[PDB]
Every structure is written in structure tokens, then in C-alpha cells.
Structure 1
Amino acid sequence: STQVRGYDFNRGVNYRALLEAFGTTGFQATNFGRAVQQVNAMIEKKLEPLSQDEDQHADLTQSRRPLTSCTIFLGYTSNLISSGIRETIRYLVQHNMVDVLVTTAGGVEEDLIKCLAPTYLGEFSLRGKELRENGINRIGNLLVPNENYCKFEDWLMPILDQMVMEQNTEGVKWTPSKMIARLGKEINNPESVYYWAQKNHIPVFSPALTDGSLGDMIFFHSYKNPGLVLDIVEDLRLINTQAIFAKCTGMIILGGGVVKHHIANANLMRNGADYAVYINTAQEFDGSDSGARPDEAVSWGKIRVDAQPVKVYADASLVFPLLVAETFAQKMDAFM
């Protein structure tokens, strides 16, 4: 039995000790401590060597990425890529610390656009009428000028031309994940999440990739250069095979919606993830999958019965950099 006790600032500001004290502080601070333990378990598993038997089974995929003892799925909503958590995610992907990414369309395009033009701080209360009259789009307390999307249009249209030509003359069958790899290669910029994902052979799934600015541009482009196809069925096979042939899996899911369900549903194909951490502000009472507790996923087989999953009820812009500081960033040497 562990007693409740908070950090005593009479010791001074010892930041590592202060973070470690969240575990015995209670409420969501304790869940944060549990999340640190869960992610550290994923990492310690990932760094354990594969045995001959495990290596054989795990090599049964047609994937370029070297195999590890724990395949980590990282999911995040679009708002987090507009936020500075974009830098946190880029770091993990840059250093091969996660294996599969799932995000929404905005979570793809806003990373690429930040390589062309920045996002700014604003306020939640700013009025839409005056913002619209000035061509400024609001995302929470952030602001994106519409010229950001003008710049995106100029950058993206020549790539769309090439994708259609490769489709029609070289037999390419595009899917969202293949498009995202190509866009990351094109952006060719070390500040971009998707640049590092394609460089490190980390696939990115986004089955509703048309639901944003990328879609806007594909739509306009289709009138002068018709026929681009994005198949979502092949990408479903690809993500499910990453779960089925994993030795162990971990899920780290920031936010709700499709990013959460799609990762969890892939792990149901292996009868459940071994480790799971959720960070989101959704509540269960309306029955939404977004707000469901991890124990709902256990009933489905999306999380194993013997797992000890954790949800932290918090804005990930506060908690996720602290989690990374106490986990992945402490083992950076092992990932290089």
C-alpha cells in the first residue's frame, strides 16, 4: 500500500524528483506516473532482443523497417500538429522511437505547411466574423493565416500532377500511407514529422485523408487532371499486418476519434495490445468511443486482459512533453 505524499519544495526545485512525485500525488498526477511506467515498459520491451522464434514470426511482413520486440503505434489528432506537440512527435519519429503513426488529414497537412509558414498564438475568444474578414483561421487559441494554404497549394499541385502521371503511366496504386510517404520525401525538411517518417520507414495511416486542405487541393486538381484514386482497402491490410505480426505492441493515443479507434481496431486483430496509454479530455458518459475508458477496449479484445492500461485525463499539450521527458528522452542513446 502506497501513501499519498506530494513533492516537498523545501528540498528546492529538483525537477526529476518533482516529476517522480506525481505518482504519489493522486488523481491525474498518479495516472501520469502510471503512464510513465507503461511507456517505460514499452521501451524496455522494445529494446529486448528478439529470440530466434520471435524473429521468425515477426519477419513475416513485407515491411522495410527492422523488427523490434515491441511495435509502438502513436496516434494523434490534428490540433496537436498545429500545437508545439508537433516538435515532440517529430523527435520520436526522427529517432525511430515509434513504429506506426495514425493521424487525421489535418495532422498530415499542418506538419507540411509549418515548413512553409508558421502558426501563431492567439486566444479562444477571438470572434470569427472579424477573423474571417481578415482571412485568419482559428484553431483553439492558435491562428493560421489563409495565405498558409495558398503556399500549400503552390507547393502541392505539381506533386499531384506527378502522382497522377505515375498512376497512369507507371501503374502506381496510391493509398493514403503511400501519399504521405511521398509528401514527406518531397517536403525534404528535418523539421517535418513526415519527412522523418518516410526516411525511417515508419508508415502513416490516415484513412480519411481527403478531410482537409489536402482534400481541398485534390478536389480542385481533379478538374484539370482527373482520375486520381486513393484506395483505403490496401492501407487497412497494411496497418492490420503491423499488429498481427508484432511480437508485442504498445498504443500511445493522443485524443479521440478515428486515430484512437483505428489503432485499437488493428490491435484487436492480434487479440489486444500489451501496453496502452491514452491522453485525452473526452468523457465516457455520452457513449462515444473517444471518451471510453481503456476498460471498454478490454471487453472488445483491443487491449489484452492482462494489460495494465492507463488513461490520463488532460490536454496533451501539457502532459505529452512531460511524458516523453520521463521516458523516451531518457533512453535516447539506445535509439541511436
Structure 2
Amino acid sequence: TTPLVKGYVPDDNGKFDFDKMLEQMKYCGFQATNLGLAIDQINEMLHYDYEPKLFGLGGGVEGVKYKPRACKIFLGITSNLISSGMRDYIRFLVKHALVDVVVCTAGGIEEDFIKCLAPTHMGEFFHDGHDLRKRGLNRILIVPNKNYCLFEDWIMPILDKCLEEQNTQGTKWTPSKLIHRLGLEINNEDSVWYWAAKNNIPVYSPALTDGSIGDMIYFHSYNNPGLVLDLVEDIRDMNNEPLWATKTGCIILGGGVVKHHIMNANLYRNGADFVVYVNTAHDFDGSDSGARPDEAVSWGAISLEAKPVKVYAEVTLVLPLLVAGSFSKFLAE
């Protein structure tokens, strides 16, 4: 008495209905069943409400529409998603304050600010590593060497004012606080970080030193000594983020420290209510990145009530449909 496999047949006339393909992705089978179930989990998150905290209130910027939600949404993004064309589908999620908190790796924090400062070039996976070094081109998708130098000119002043403020006004800086101040400083509507500063969305990176930001902190300390970043205050803030909400949902795209920090934080909450994982990793090696949603339920990161969905696919293919079949419909609605 279970559902029947059935694809949507293409139109004889030739005007394909992309809307009808999206609806029938769930019944195709294999990884398409996952994409359809992934759309369903996010739809439950955006349209959640109860009769007694409101989230997605936003910062009340004019000319922008926000809709209130009873669900808190944590988005885990690896550096790849803030380096690929998935930035346009994440800026939209932050601008309308559809995501309450973001946790990102340090290269991703550095990429948004460099992207707003300068553009990214296209390239191939099979490119000679030795040659790319001679041309000073990094690889991930080519982000040029000159790009980081423009970023260095921007970040160094904010830290110097942070050092001046720390000694004079007793401001104890942490990694999250540097990013929120850095996002306010960019003042570019292109940035996902500017919108989080305007809409009061906290961004947390536990290894902020691992990345371009950490090298700039290192050079500044020799020139201006004594800057201190306290992880103890940051772990106090991050762990408390899930405790407040009636329900919390985790859209972790990619794997790594970001998968673990959001899942670890949800332990204090007894487990995340809803979750979607999109990555290209397998559980055979015993790694955390490839660990299936089942392993996360083992240590209490996922609520036993939840029905976690993992799409075993590159995010660049799965997310564009995921925004189309969930967030776009609710905001316009």
C-alpha cells in the first residue's frame, strides 16, 4: 500500500513544465526521492506556528518584506557554498531574514567580503597545480591571489579600532563579534554578512584563525600586540543559541566543523527538530563529515522525533531547486 514510482512525461508540444517536474521529483526514486523529501522538510520549517517567540522579525529595513516564524533556522554553510553561485540563493535567504543564525568556516567568511570587493573567475577540476601557482591563481572555481590583498586593506582597520576599543572601553572581542562588526562595515547590499548585520543574525566560526582572517590577525599582532579573541565567550553564546526557540531547524550543506558545531549546540536543546544534509561523503571511513544522520541521532544531536533527510549530491545541483520549491513560494505568498 506504499507509493508508486512514476516520472512526469514531457509535453508533446515542447513547452516543458518545470513546476510539474519539481512536483514529480519525489516519485522518480533514488536521489530524486531525497530532493522532494528535502523540499518538504524546509516547507515545514518556514510554515511553523503555535499558540503560546517570533523569529524572522528582521531589523525593519525599509523596502524589504519579512514574514514572522515560530521556528529558528540555523544554516551551516561550508566555504564552497559561499564561493559558488549558491551565494545568490543564500543572500536572498538572509536578506528576508528567513534564517535566524549562520555558522560558517573561515574561508567562507573571507569569501563573502572578498566577493563584494572583487569577482570570481570560472575554471576546470583538472588544471595543473604547478602552473596555477606560477599564475598565482588559487583553486577550489579560481579565486585570484590579487583578491586577498584588496581584502587585507579592508580588514586591518576594523581590528585596530577593536584593539583600541578593547583597552579603552573594556570590550572583550570574540570571533562572532568581529564578524558582526565586519559585516556592518562592508555596507554592500551584495553581502550575505551585511544583511545579517542589518537583520541581527549572529555568525559563528570556531576556527576563525584557520583561513585568510587568521593570517591577517597574525600579521597585525606583530605590528600591534595584545589582541585577544576569547573562545570561552563564543562557546557560551553559540551553545545558548538553540536553547531559546520553540523549534530549531538545521540546513547543513557540506560537512566538517560546521556540521559538528550546529549539531553539538543542539545537544543542549536535547536535539534539533528538523534537518537537511546535502554532501558527497560516505560513512565507511568512520569520519564525522560522512556520518549518516543516524550517527548524529546516536550522540543526541538529532531529536528522536525528527525525520532527518540527507541528499547524497553536490549542493550546486540540489539547492537551486530547494529554494525554488520552498522559500520563494512562502515569501511571495
| TM-score where L is the length of structure 2 | 0.93
User: Deviation per CA, 1:91-111, whole angstroms, max 9, x where unpaired?
Assistant: 101101011100000110100
In structure 2, distance between residues paired with 1:225 and 1:304: 46
Q: Specify the code of the residue in structure 2 equivalent to 1:309.
A: P
CA contact (8 A) 2:180 2:197 kept: yes
The question of 1:319 aligning with 2:318 is answered: yes
- What is the CA deviation profile of residues 186-207 of structure 1, one whole-angstrom value per residue up to 9, with x for unaligned ones? 1110000100111111100101
What does residue 64 of structure 2 align with? Answer: none
SS in 2 for 1:78: coil
Kindly state the Cα deviation for residue 68 of structure 1 after the two structures are TM-superposed. 4.1
Query: Which contiguous aligned blocks of 4+ residues in structure 1 show a shift greater than 3 angstroms?
Result: 64-68
1:23 aligns with 2:20: no
**CA deviation digits over 1:103-129, x for unaligned, max 9?**
000110100001111111011111111
Aligned residue in 1 for 2:212: 213
The amino acid that maps onto 1:94 is K
Equivalent residue number for residue 100 of structure 2? 99
> Is residue 2:3 matched to residue 1:2?
yes
Please give the secondary structure, in 2, of the residue aligned with 1:288.
coil
The match for 2:328 is 329
Match of 2:242 in 1: 243
Larger CA deviation: 11-20 vs 289-298 = 11-20
Matches for 1:220-299 after TM superposition, within 5 Å: 220-299=219-298
Instruction: Give deviations 1:64-99, integer Å, cap 9, x for gaps.
Output: 999842111100101111111112111101101011
Query: Is 1:34 equivalent to 2:37 in the alignment?
Result: yes
Q: Provide the C-alpha distance between the structure 2 equivalents of 1:134 and 1:315, rounded to a whole number of angstroms.
A: 28
Which amino acid in structure 1 is aligned with residue 197 of structure 2? Q
Partner of 1:113: 114
What is the deviation of 1:333?
A: 3.6
Q: TM-score, normalised by structure 1?
A: 0.92
Aligned mates of 1:39, 1:17 — CA distance in 2: 19
Mapped to 1, the partners of 2:117 and 2:73 lie a distance apart of 30
By how many angstroms is 1:10 displaced? 3.0
Once residues 332 and 221 of structure 2 are traced to their aligned partners in structure 1, the CA distance between those partners, rounded to angstroms, is 47
Determine whether 1:13 maps to 2:12: no
Q: Distance in 2 between matches of 1:165 and 1:333?
A: 45
Name 1:134's counterpart in structure 2: 135
What is residue 189 of structure 2 aligned with on the other side? Answer: 190
Offset, 1:260: 0.4
On the 8 A contact 2:243/2:268 being kept in 1, the answer is yes
Instruction: Answer yes or no: is the 8 Å Cα contact 2:31–2:311 preserved in 1.
Output: yes
Deviations 1:257-312 (A, max 9, x none): 01001101111111111111001011111111111111111122211112111000
Mark the CA change 1:42 to 1:86 in structure 2 (over 3 Å): closer, same or farther. Answer: same
Q: Which amino acid aligns with 2:175?
A: P
Q: Distance in 2 between matches of 1:257 and 1:34?
A: 23
* 1:202 aligned partner: 201
Letter aligned with residue 233 of structure 2: E
Residue 166 (structure 1) aligns with: 165
| Matches of 1:68 and 1:144, distance apart in 2 | 37
Q: How many residues align?
A: 322
Gaps of 5+ in 1: none
Structure 1 residues 330 and 30: CA distance shift in structure 2, 3 A: same
Task: Please tell me whether the aligned partners of residues 47 and 69 of structure 2 are also in contact (alpha carbons under 8 angstroms).
Answer: no
| Percent of aligned pairs sharing the same letter | 62
1:83 aligns with 2:84: yes
Distance between the aligned counterparts of 2:286 and 2:206, measured in 1?
23
